[PDB]
């Protein structure tokens, strides 16, 4: 009952400043013992940042010393980090999280999704998205595969279901792979029954918050 | 302040084998007779799940086949039977003092037996190709091992430093991989040849596969 939902992920340049919120619902911002925020660079491997005590008191990890800010709003049931001065090694998915009052307090069994921030001179550009349609040459055993090719975004990340998320079964999103020109390529294919394609439709939803641009492409 | 070392980085096992995986602080993470070492499930995707409190408390709704146990400065994770929905990377975290710290994560992988990919080509669409690139799709579908060699050929010219592919993570329900790689080439290059394949090397094909159409029927 108790989720945490954060906000303001994205594209940011070298130099610039970020705003992460952290939405808590189902639970009191002020009943928590500690609130916080934790980073993970996309090559992998956690990092403590920043924490808020009920009574207010905030800590830093040295590791950023002077350009963090955590904050919160009780009316709002919200809190808040900042960070300015931005280098590419800021470059990280962002979790907020819960900590407890019980067992030493610095252990985490609450998070949020976690967001995304990239730092990066280049711009935001939308995807194309692009069939990848079902064939004999797709179709070996009594089931098929299809699927869809988005193709030229920047930055990560980019979302993808299937007929509005009703369509999981069989389904496989591959990781975005970077081309030579800066711009990332990611596909996603199903695979299902060769006897449903002249009767079933099939529509992946393609999301790039970035940029934007929502695609619903039927294949 | 304060490093944690994990053992091994990586690992992989059968389905029901026990799985230990240890934890080394430079200091100890020992306070009143309790030790403040945790676990963390980090599954693909997602924000990491706490498994274990300080040292041995299992985290509630979390299964009793994970336990942990230690004291001081060595610790160990264990999973008494691995379950294929147990891939995942693995974190210790001590919270003894602030900059609070966690392991560089063990990767688990369950070993199943060997299963050959299924392979699909995909030829590019109109609708790209006036957009004047070609981008060629080959499916590997649910394989293990993870390994496996992909080769693009042209009108049989071998085609190199002209594609990129992508593994997914291993998937709980069958504990296969999935792989997809794309070839790009200019609509006029594409235009000008026939035939397009897709070679597949793997542990469970005797020998080679190959997908392949002609343009023409794309």
């Known amino acids: 009952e108790v989720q945490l939902v954060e906000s303001g992920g994205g594209l940011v340049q070298p130099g610039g400043s970020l705003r992460l919120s952290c939405a808590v619902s189902?639970?009191?911002?002020?009943?928590?013992?500690?609130w916080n925020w934790i980073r993970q660079a996309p090559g992998k491997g956690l990092e403590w940042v920043a924490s808020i005590t009920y009574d207010g008191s905030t800590n830093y990890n040295p590791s950023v010393k002077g350009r963090i800010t955590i904050s919160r709003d009780d009316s709002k049931n919200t809190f808040y980090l900042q960070m300015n001065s931005l280098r590419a090694e800021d470059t990280a998915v962002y979790y907020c999280?819960?900590?407890?009052?019980?067992?030493?307090?610095?252990?985490?069994?609450?998070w949020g999704q976690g967001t995304l921030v990239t730092v990066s001179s280049a711009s935001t550009k939308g995807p194309s998205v692009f069939p990848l349609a079902p064939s004999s040459k797709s179709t070996s055993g009594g089931t098929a595969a299809l699927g869809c090719l988005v193709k030229d975004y920047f930055p990560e990340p980019v979302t993808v279901s299937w007929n509005s998320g009703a369509l999981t079964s069989g389904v496989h999103t591959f990781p975005a792979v970077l081309q030579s020109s800066g711009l990332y390529s990611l596909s996603s294919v199903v695979t299902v029954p060769s006897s449903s394609l002249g009767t079933q439709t099939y529509i992946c939803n393609v999301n790039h918050k970035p940029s934007n641009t929502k695609v619903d492409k039927k294949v | 302040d304060i490093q944690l070392t994990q053992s091994p980085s990586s690992l992989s096992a059968s389905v029901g084998d026990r799985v230990t995986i240890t934890c080394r602080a430079s200091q100890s993470v020992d306070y009143d007779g309790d030790s403040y070492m945790n676990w963390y499930q980090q599954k693909p995707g997602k924000a990491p799940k706490l498994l274990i409190y300080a040292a041995s408390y299992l985290e509630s709704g979390v299964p009793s086949r994970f336990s942990g146990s230690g004291s001081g400065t060595d610790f160990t994770l264990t999973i008494s039977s691995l379950q294929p929905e147990d891939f995942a990377t693995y974190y210790c975290?001590?919270?003894?003092?602030?900059?609070?710290?966690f392991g560089q994560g063990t990767k688990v992988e369950i070993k199943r037996t060997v299963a050959a990919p299924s392979v699909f080509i995909f030829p590019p669409s109109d609708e790209q190709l006036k957009s004047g690139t070609a981008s060629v799709v080959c499916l590997l579908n649910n394989f293990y091992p993870r390994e496996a060699k992909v080769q693009w050929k042209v009108d049989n010219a071998l085609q190199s430093g002209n594609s990129q592919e992508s593994v997914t993570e291993q998937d709980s329900k069958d504990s296969t991989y999935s792989l997809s790689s794309t070839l790009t080439l200019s609509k006029a290059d594409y235009e000008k040849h026939k035939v397009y394949a897709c070679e597949v090397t793997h542990q469970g094909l005797s020998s080679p596969v190959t997908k392949s159409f002609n343009r023409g029927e794309c």
């Open positions: 189902g639970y009191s911002i002020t009943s928590g013992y500690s």
């Open positions: 975290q001590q919270s003894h003092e602030d900059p609070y710290t």
């Open positions: 999280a819960r900590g407890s009052h019980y067992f030493g307090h610095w252990h985490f069994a609450v």
